[PDB]
Amino acid sequence: RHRKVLRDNIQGITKPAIRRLARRGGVKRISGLIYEETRGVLKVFLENVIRDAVTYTEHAKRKTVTAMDVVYALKRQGRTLYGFGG
Amino acid sequence: VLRDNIQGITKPAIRRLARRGGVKRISGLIYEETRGVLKVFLENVIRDAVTYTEHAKRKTVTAMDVVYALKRQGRTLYGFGG
Amino acid sequence: VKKPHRYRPGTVALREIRRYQKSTELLIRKLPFQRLVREIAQDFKTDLRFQSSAVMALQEACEAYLVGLFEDTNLCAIHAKRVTIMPKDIQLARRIRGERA
Amino acid sequence: FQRLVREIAQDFKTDLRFQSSAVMALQEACEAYLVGLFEDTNLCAIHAKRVTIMPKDIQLARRIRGERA
Amino acid sequence: KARAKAKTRSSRAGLQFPVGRVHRLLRKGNYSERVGAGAPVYLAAVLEYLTAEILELAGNAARDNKKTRIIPRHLQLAIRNDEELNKLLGRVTIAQGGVLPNIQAVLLPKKTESHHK
Amino acid sequence: RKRSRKESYSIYVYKVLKQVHPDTGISSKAMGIMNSFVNDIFERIAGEASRLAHYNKRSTITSREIQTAVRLLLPGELAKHAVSEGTKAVTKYTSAK
Amino acid sequence: RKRSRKESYSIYVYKVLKQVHPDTGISSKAMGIMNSFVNDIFERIAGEASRLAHYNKRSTITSREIQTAVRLLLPGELAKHAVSEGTKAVTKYTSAK
């Protein structure tokens, strides 16, 4: 069988979830093409963040990524985050 | 006569600036808005600059004060020292 | 009624708006997001593990960023006398914010 | 430009003096900011299938970049 | 010797925040070689005033929802509804904060939906 | 029984809250938020003050530098109120040792 | 005769320019730009290194901290080439004390 759930990847981030997020953004009517582009955008953001986090992780010689590394990585990109320590 | 002095920044200078931005056609109402916009930017900068100037208890404004005040708005400037 | 009750187009979305804006619970499901994180981390370094709170924090950041993006998107849309958002709006928003792609 | 700067600074603190280079620096910063804004504005105008820029274009761009003022 | 009893500087400043802790955090962190005595009092007072302002707004929003305990939603509402704090925290995300209910007027249905025959 | 000690600013915030709105509590998560907030503001001010010191070849950071930093970061009336509180506080400190 | 002393990075820029393009000059204004650039990158990197060291409670800055900072601040291939150059420099310096 080839199930590979919708790709065994991002495509499990289904349409109605994106719809809900768009509803939070005040959006009322959405085209079918938004979905794919959104996924791409999301991927890019995540990549950069994770890279920085992992870099911090590599400096301390750890194999477990902690919350604090992520917070600092989010801080350097101008997306400071409150409520997860520091 | 002077017109609160913002009017020294004439229309055609603004037109030249827009031309450098790659713009072809400009409505007549932009100019006034632009003036107001410009004023705000300048005001903020100068405030910061003067504040630095005030900390040194000086009366002459130096370029470095401006450079730092620009640095703090995320519009870092090169080419005037430091 | 012979007819099943049916709401006109453009109301259930509004109901969704008010419901999700009154609440704060995360909209995206945890598992696929978790699998995505692990898959992406694998391509940079091997055999990494993740604390749960780190994933939750990432999820919060992603949702806030996208929410803000959709706000800016809808404004860019409204400027063009539309109500339906499209990709070129997103591309414009990201061009103006100063990001890369 | 010199007279404008002098008037505003006078409104904040009196009898100030200005180095020439500081004035030049402000000049450069202003012009760079303006051209950046007009560039993004022009994109916004083209997005609406027009070629003539209008105030709401500027307001839109300024609202998105976070310079809300 | 008398060894006068251990009054603290916070009480002297009429403050609740800990002066000494701030002094320690400035020494440790390599902000500057020297630190002046008056700085941390000023600094602690600043932090206290801002904290009071925030909590005031949050408590008002809390009373609006008939809840006696402040939760994050209330803090997000407090920050976004005050202009100055929004400027100060323009690039900050409050976890579990959500957003304001602002919907643009255009996408709302026609107010001329009335007696029509 | 290795027993740690993680410091925070929680209790002070709780005191202030009971002073301003006596019949009200606050969850732990919100307190954590406020803790992170205070940490952020402290870092911003200290960094700014440091740069101010270095530009003027001064080796002491003083109340004046803090005041300058606050006038830079914050807008208008908020700055004025903060400055007034600080001045009152330092004036009380200087006298009643 | 009381007179001052202003430091810069002019000479080093000039050396490098002669090394890569021996028959070519450069104006003073552009030299000023390069001076500002160098100072800016110096400030950025040192700031980042400081933040890293503080978060791990280590009081020392070594080449490792600089390297990590570089990989964070600079993108991709540029970071790789820079890392290689710095590594070669350190290996030659420690070999030829």
Side-chain angles (χ1 to χ4, degrees), chain G:
Chain G
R1 179 58 190 97
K2 61 103 179 174
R3 188 65 276 197
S4 181
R5 183 186 174 73
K6 153 60 88 166
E7 294 180 65
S8 302
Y9 290 86
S10 305
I11 66 182
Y12 312 110
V13 171
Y14 210 92
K15 282 174 180 200
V16 166
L17 173 61
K18 292 292 114 167
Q19 158 178 311
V20 76
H21 284 302
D23 55 288
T24 298
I26 183 165
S27 169
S28 67
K29 283 174 151 294
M31 181 59 81
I33 285 151
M34 295 302 297
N35 181 15
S36 188
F37 167 82
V38 170
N39 276 309
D40 178 38
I41 296 304
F42 178 46
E43 188 161 4
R44 283 193 217 187
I45 284 168
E48 186 62 43
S50 172
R51 283 179 48 271
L52 269 58
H54 184 267
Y55 295 156
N56 291 271
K57 292 164 268 271
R58 292 171 59 254
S59 180
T60 320
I61 277 165
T62 74
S63 65
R64 306 182 60 229
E65 283 275 352
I66 303 303
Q67 180 161 277
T68 301
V70 169
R71 285 205 264 97
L72 279 176
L73 207 152
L74 274 52
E77 78 299 26
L78 212 58
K80 289 303 308 183
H81 293 321
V83 158
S84 176
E85 290 278 275
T87 304
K88 279 172 194 172
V90 165
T91 59
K92 193 189 182 295
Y93 174 77
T94 193
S95 161
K97 280 184 181 69

Side-chain angles (χ1 to χ4, degrees), chain D residues 1-64:
Chain D
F1 189 83
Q2 273 163 6
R3 289 195 284 86
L4 172 55
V5 163
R6 286 169 193 280
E7 181 260 306
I8 281 165
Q10 181 271 3
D11 202 328
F12 293 128
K13 173 171 173 62
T14 64
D15 74 275
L16 283 168
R17 298 161 93 154
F18 276 111
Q19 291 184 334
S20 60
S21 57
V23 173
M24 294 302 300
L26 283 161
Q27 210 169 324
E28 286 287 350
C30 286
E31 292 193 18
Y33 168 79
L34 272 299
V35 297
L37 178 56
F38 285 122
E39 189 163 18
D40 298 352
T41 298
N42 202 31
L43 293 177
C44 289
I46 283 162
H47 187 71
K49 306 284 153 51
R50 292 182 279 106
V51 193
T52 310
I53 63 162
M54 311 175 54
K56 58 173 147 181
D57 297 319
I58 289 171
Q59 289 156 14
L60 184 53
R62 290 207 67 243
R63 184 256 176 284
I64 289 168

Side-chain angles (χ1 to χ4, degrees), chain E:
Chain E
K1 65 101 169 187
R3 182 64 188 163
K5 64 188 294 301
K7 59 185 299 194
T8 177
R9 298 196 272 177
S10 52
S11 310
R12 265 208 287 259
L15 301 175
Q16 308 298 65
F17 270 55
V19 169
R21 179 167 290 183
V22 165
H23 191 122
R24 190 179 70 220
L25 289 167
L26 284 170
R27 289 190 63 168
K28 290 171 182 63
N30 292 323
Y31 294 113
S32 288
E33 185 62 20
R34 306 291 297 282
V35 177
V41 172
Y42 203 106
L43 179 49
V46 163
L47 293 173
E48 176 171 90
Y49 169 67
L50 295 172
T51 291
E53 196 179 35
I54 288 281
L55 296 174
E56 172 60 21
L57 298 170
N60 293 349
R63 259 181 293 92
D64 193 308
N65 300 7
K66 306 180 273 273
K67 299 247 179 189
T68 61
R69 163 191 304 163
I70 280 165
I71 54 166
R73 176 60 172 178
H74 300 155
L75 292 165
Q76 179 81 322
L77 286 178
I79 286 166
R80 303 304 177 197
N81 282 321
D82 183 5
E83 269 61 23
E84 284 74 346
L85 297 165
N86 182 50
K87 260 170 69 174
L88 176 59
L89 310 182
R91 299 319 300 253
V92 157
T93 295
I94 300 284
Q96 291 291 302
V99 299
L100 294 180
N102 54 351
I103 73 183
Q104 189 67 247
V106 63
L107 73 162
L108 188 162
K110 173 54 63 154
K111 298 311 208 162
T112 314
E113 287 163 35
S114 55
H115 194 171
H116 289 324
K117 296 288 204 176

Side-chain angles (χ1 to χ4, degrees), chain C residues 71-72 75-77 79-82 88-89 92-93 95-97, chain D residues 39-40 43-45 47-50 56-57 60-61 63-65:
Chain C
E71 291 289 336
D72 301 351
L75 292 178
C76 290
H79 183 62
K81 301 187 147 161
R82 296 190 326 263
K88 57 168 151 182
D89 299 319
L92 175 58
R95 186 73 173 79
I96 291 167
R97 281 172 159 214
Chain D
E39 189 163 18
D40 298 352
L43 293 177
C44 289
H47 187 71
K49 306 284 153 51
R50 292 182 279 106
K56 58 173 147 181
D57 297 319
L60 184 53
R63 184 256 176 284
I64 289 168
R65 62 164 60 214

Side-chain angles (χ1 to χ4, degrees), chain F residues 40-73:
Chain F
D40 185 16
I41 305 309
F42 173 57
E43 179 166 37
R44 282 192 213 183
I45 290 169
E48 183 60 41
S50 170
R51 283 184 280 93
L52 268 70
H54 281 128
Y55 298 153
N56 291 272
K57 287 89 184 178
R58 299 297 205 71
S59 284
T60 48
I61 200 163
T62 64
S63 67
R64 278 201 302 169
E65 280 73 350
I66 303 302
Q67 180 165 121
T68 296
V70 168
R71 281 208 185 125
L72 286 170
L73 277 64

Side-chain angles (χ1 to χ4, degrees), chain A residues 8 10 13 20-26 28-29 31 34 37 47 49 51 63-67 74 84, chain C residues 13 16 20-21 23 25 27-28 32 35-36 40 44 49-51 57-58 67 70-71 84-85 87 90-91:
Chain A
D8 208 20
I10 55 180
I13 307 303
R20 284 191 295 274
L21 288 158
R23 293 278 194 266
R24 184 163 285 176
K28 181 170 178 198
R29 208 153 181 281
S31 153
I34 285 287
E37 190 158 88
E47 204 83 356
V49 174
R51 184 179 288 158
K63 293 191 94 73
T64 309
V65 172
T66 57
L74 284 168
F84 291 108
Chain C
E16 283 176 4
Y20 293 117
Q21 287 184 334
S23 178
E25 204 277 300
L27 311 174
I28 294 165
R35 281 184 304 92
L36 173 57
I40 282 166
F44 294 123
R49 299 174 161 202
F50 271 111
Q51 293 181 333
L58 281 162
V67 165
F70 279 138
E71 291 289 336
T84 308
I85 58 166
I90 285 173
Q91 292 154 17

